[PDB]
Design an enzyme around this catalytic site. Structure first.
Site, PDB file in Angstrom:
ATOM      1  N   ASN A 120      12.360   0.587 -17.639  1.00 48.56           N
ATOM      2  CA  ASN A 120      11.378   1.438 -16.983  1.00 48.56           C
ATOM      3  C   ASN A 120      10.111   1.514 -17.823  1.00 48.56           C
ATOM      4  OD1 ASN A 120      10.897   3.156 -14.671  1.00 48.56           O
ATOM      5  ND2 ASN A 120      10.947   4.906 -16.074  1.00 48.56           N
ATOM      6  N   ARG A 121       9.006   1.935 -17.218  1.00 47.89           N
ATOM      7  CA  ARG A 121       7.741   2.018 -17.944  1.00 47.89           C
ATOM      8  C   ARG A 121       7.707   3.209 -18.884  1.00 47.89           C
ATOM      9  NH1 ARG A 121       2.544   0.117 -14.456  1.00 47.89           N
ATOM     10  NH2 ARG A 121       3.386  -1.879 -13.695  1.00 47.89           N
ATOM     11  N   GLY A 173      13.042   0.698 -13.002  1.00 45.61           N
ATOM     12  CA  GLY A 173      11.856   1.201 -12.333  1.00 45.61           C
ATOM     13  C   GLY A 173      12.039   2.472 -11.530  1.00 45.61           C
ATOM     14  N   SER A 174      12.822   3.404 -12.063  1.00 50.95           N
ATOM     15  CA  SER A 174      12.997   4.700 -11.423  1.00 50.95           C
ATOM     16  C   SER A 174      12.958   5.825 -12.449  1.00 50.95           C
ATOM     17  CB  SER A 174      14.311   4.747 -10.642  1.00 50.95           C
ATOM     18  OG  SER A 174      14.469   5.998  -9.992  1.00 50.95           O
ATOM     19  N   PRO A 225       0.827  -1.212   0.000  1.00 48.85           N
ATOM     20  CA  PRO A 225       0.000   0.000   0.000  1.00 48.85           C
ATOM     21  C   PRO A 225       0.861   1.262   0.000  1.00 48.85           C
ATOM     22  CG  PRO A 225      -0.802  -1.573   1.618  1.00 48.85           C
ATOM     23  CD  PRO A 225       0.521  -2.089   1.143  1.00 48.85           C
ATOM     24  N   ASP A 226       0.477   2.249  -0.805  1.00 54.88           N
ATOM     25  CA  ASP A 226       1.241   3.487  -0.928  1.00 54.88           C
ATOM     26  C   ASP A 226       1.311   4.261   0.386  1.00 54.88           C
ATOM     27  OD1 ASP A 226      -1.452   3.907  -1.058  1.00 54.88           O
ATOM     28  OD2 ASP A 226      -1.437   4.903  -3.015  1.00 54.88           O
ATOM     29  N   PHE A 227       2.312   5.127   0.498  1.00 53.84           N
ATOM     30  CA  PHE A 227       2.547   5.865   1.732  1.00 53.84           C
ATOM     31  C   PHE A 227       3.028   7.288   1.469  1.00 53.84           C
ATOM     32  CE2 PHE A 227       6.139   3.169   0.635  1.00 53.84           C
ATOM     33  CZ  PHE A 227       7.193   4.062   0.593  1.00 53.84           C
ATOM     34  N   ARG A 228       2.732   7.805   0.281  1.00 55.22           N
ATOM     35  CA  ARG A 228       3.195   9.134  -0.096  1.00 55.22           C
ATOM     36  C   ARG A 228       2.064  10.050  -0.553  1.00 55.22           C
ATOM     37  NH1 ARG A 228       8.920   7.928  -3.353  1.00 55.22           N
ATOM     38  NH2 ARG A 228       9.808   6.519  -1.775  1.00 55.22           N
ATOM     39  N   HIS A 252      17.930   6.157   0.987  1.00 56.02           N
ATOM     40  CA  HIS A 252      16.922   6.770   1.843  1.00 56.02           C
ATOM     41  C   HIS A 252      16.741   5.949   3.112  1.00 56.02           C
ATOM     42  CE1 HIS A 252      16.230   9.678  -1.157  1.00 56.02           C
ATOM     43  NE2 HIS A 252      15.437   8.966  -1.938  1.00 56.02           N
ATOM     44  N   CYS A 293      20.066   3.601  27.471  1.00 59.24           N
ATOM     45  CA  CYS A 293      19.651   4.865  28.070  1.00 59.24           C
ATOM     46  C   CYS A 293      18.727   4.646  29.268  1.00 59.24           C
ATOM     47  CB  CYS A 293      18.956   5.742  27.022  1.00 59.24           C
ATOM     48  SG  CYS A 293      20.071   6.527  25.835  1.00 59.24           S
ATOM     49  N   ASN A 340      14.184   2.843  -2.468  1.00 62.91           N
ATOM     50  CA  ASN A 340      13.116   2.230  -1.689  1.00 62.91           C
ATOM     51  C   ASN A 340      13.492   2.013  -0.230  1.00 62.91           C
ATOM     52  OD1 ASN A 340      12.014   2.148  -4.239  1.00 62.91           O
ATOM     53  ND2 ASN A 340      12.185  -0.079  -4.468  1.00 62.91           N
ATOM     54  N   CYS A 387      21.813   8.029  22.329  1.00 67.30           N
ATOM     55  CA  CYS A 387      23.122   7.400  22.490  1.00 67.30           C
ATOM     56  C   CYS A 387      23.575   6.651  21.239  1.00 67.30           C
ATOM     57  CB  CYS A 387      23.129   6.458  23.696  1.00 67.30           C
ATOM     58  SG  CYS A 387      22.404   4.839  23.381  1.00 67.30           S
ATOM     59  N   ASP A 425      11.418  -0.149   1.565  1.00 64.66           N
ATOM     60  CA  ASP A 425      10.631  -1.341   1.870  1.00 64.66           C
ATOM     61  C   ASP A 425      11.486  -2.521   2.333  1.00 64.66           C
ATOM     62  OD1 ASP A 425      11.579  -2.620  -0.607  1.00 64.66           O
ATOM     63  OD2 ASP A 425      10.172  -1.283  -1.630  1.00 64.66           O
ATOM     64  N   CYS A 479      19.035   4.306  18.522  1.00 66.00           N
ATOM     65  CA  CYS A 479      18.532   5.228  19.535  1.00 66.00           C
ATOM     66  C   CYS A 479      18.788   6.677  19.135  1.00 66.00           C
ATOM     67  CB  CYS A 479      19.175   4.937  20.893  1.00 66.00           C
ATOM     68  SG  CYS A 479      18.773   6.140  22.189  1.00 66.00           S
TER      69      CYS A 479
HETATM   70 ZN   LIG Z   1      20.117   5.024  24.033  1.00 71.36          ZN
END
Ligand SMILES: [Zn+2]
Lengths: 21, 269
Positions: free
Chosen positions: B233-234, B208-209, B39-42, B131, B166, B114, B142, B116, B139
Site C-alpha cells: 500500500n502507499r 491498495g486498501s 474517472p472518480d465517482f465518489r 460491494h 415481468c 472495487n 422478480c 469496476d 430485476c
Molecule cells: Zn422481472
C-alpha cells in the site's frame, strides 16, 4: 529491478510511497 | 488482536512466502485500479459534475447508489454505468498478477471493494466482490438474473434495461446491475466464503486498501494469527500489525515482486 529504502525491521519505501508525520 | 510475527520481515521473506504458500487470500482496494484511467465517482470534481448539468435532481454523488433514488430516476446511475462498464478499461498489473496466481492455482480468494469489475476482465475467477459488480444484472421485482453482456446494448444506448419476464407495463421492471446499494445487505456467497476460507488461508496479501470500510476491513483480524500478512500500500496502516510493509505505488511494488518471482510472473512486466 527497482530502487527502494529499507527501514528496519520490516519497512520498504518504493516510488510513490506516502509516509508523513 | 494479532501480534506481528517476528520471523517474517523482509521482502525476501515475502517472496519466499509467495513461492511456498498455495492458498493465498488477496485483499484489494482502489489502489489496484488507479492506473487504469478511471474517472472518480465518489466526490466533486468527479463524474457527479458532468451529471449535475444533465440531472439537476442529484443531491450528491452517493445518490446514484441509493435504492430509493434509483426507483425514482435510474437514469443517472446508468450513465455512470456506461462510463465504467467492463471492456472500456484495461486491468492493471496488479490484476494480471492476481489472475496469474489464480491460473497457477495459488489463489484461495480475491476479496475486493472495487465495483469496476476489472477482475472479470483480467480473467480472475476466484473473486468475491463485497460491494458487488456489473458482472450480473437482476430485476428489481422478480429477481431474474442475466449476464453482464445481456444488458450492454441498452446501457450503451442510454436506454434503461428492461426485464423480459415481468409485464411490459411494469414501471420498476428494470435490470439493476448487482452493485450493493446503500442499506442493502452483503451477498450470502461472501460470508460462506469468509467462514471457511479463513481456516484455509496460508498467506494474506493486502494491495491498495486503507482497510477502513466494512466488511473487507474486518478480514485481517478474523484469520488465525499465525498466518503471515503482507501489506502492499502507499501508506502504512497503524491500526493493524502487518508482518511486511511494502510502501509505494502498487504497480511498482507488484512489478518488483514479479521480477523476483521469475517464471511466468516475470513475463508480466
Ligand atoms: Zn422481472
Amino acid at each position: 529491478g527497482s530502487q527502494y529504502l529499507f527501514l528496519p525491521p520490516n519497512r520498504y519505501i518504493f516510488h510513490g510511497a506516502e509516509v508523513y508525520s | 488482536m494479532r501480534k506481528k510475527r517476528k520471523d517474517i520481515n523482509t521482502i525476501e521473506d515475502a517472496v519466499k512466502l509467495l513461492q511456498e504458500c498455495k492458498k493465498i487470500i488477496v485483499l484489494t482496494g482502489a489502489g489496484v485500479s488507479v492506473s487504469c484511467g478511471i474517472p472518480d465517482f465518489r466526490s466533486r470534481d468527479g463524474i457527479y459534475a458532468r451529471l449535475a448539468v444533465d440531472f439537476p435532481d442529484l443531491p450528491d454523488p452517493q445518490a446514484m447508489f441509493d435504492i430509493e433514488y434509483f426507483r425514482k430516476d435510474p437514469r443517472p446511475f446508468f450513465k455512470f454505468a456506461k462510463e465504467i462498464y467492463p471492456g472500456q478499461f484495461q486491468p492493471s498489473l496488479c490484476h494480471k498478477f492476481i489472475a496469474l496466481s489464480d491460473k497457477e492455482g495459488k489463489l484461495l480468494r480475491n476479496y475486493t471493494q472495487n465495483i469496476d469489475t476489472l477482475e472479470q476482465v483480467a480473467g480472475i475467477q476466484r473473486i468475491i466482490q463485497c460491494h458487488g459488480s456489473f458482472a450480473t444484472a437482476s430485476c428489481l421485482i422478480c429477481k431474474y438474473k442475466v449476464d453482464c453482456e445481456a444488458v450492454r446494448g441498452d446501457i450503451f444506448n442510454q436506454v434503461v434495461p428492461r426485464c423480459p419476464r415481468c409485464p411490459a407495463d411494469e414501471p420498476l421492471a428494470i435490470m439493476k446491475p448487482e452493485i450493493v446499494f446503500f442499506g442493502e445487505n452483503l451477498p450470502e456467497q461472501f460470508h460462506r466464503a469468509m467462514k471457511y476460507d479463513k481456516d484455509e488461508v496460508d498467506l494474506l496479501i493486502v494491495i491498495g486498501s486503507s482497510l477502513k470500510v466494512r466488511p473487507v476491513a474486518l478480514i485481517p483480524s478474523s484469520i488465525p494469527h499465525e498466518v503471515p500478512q503482507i501489506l502492499i500500500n502507499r501508506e502504512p496502516l497503524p491500526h493493524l500489525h502487518f508482518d511486511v510493509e511494502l510502501l509505494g505505488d502498487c504497480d511498482v511494488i507488484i512489478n518488483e515482486l514479479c521480477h523476483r518471482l521469475g517464471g511466468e510472473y516475470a513475463k508480466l512486466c
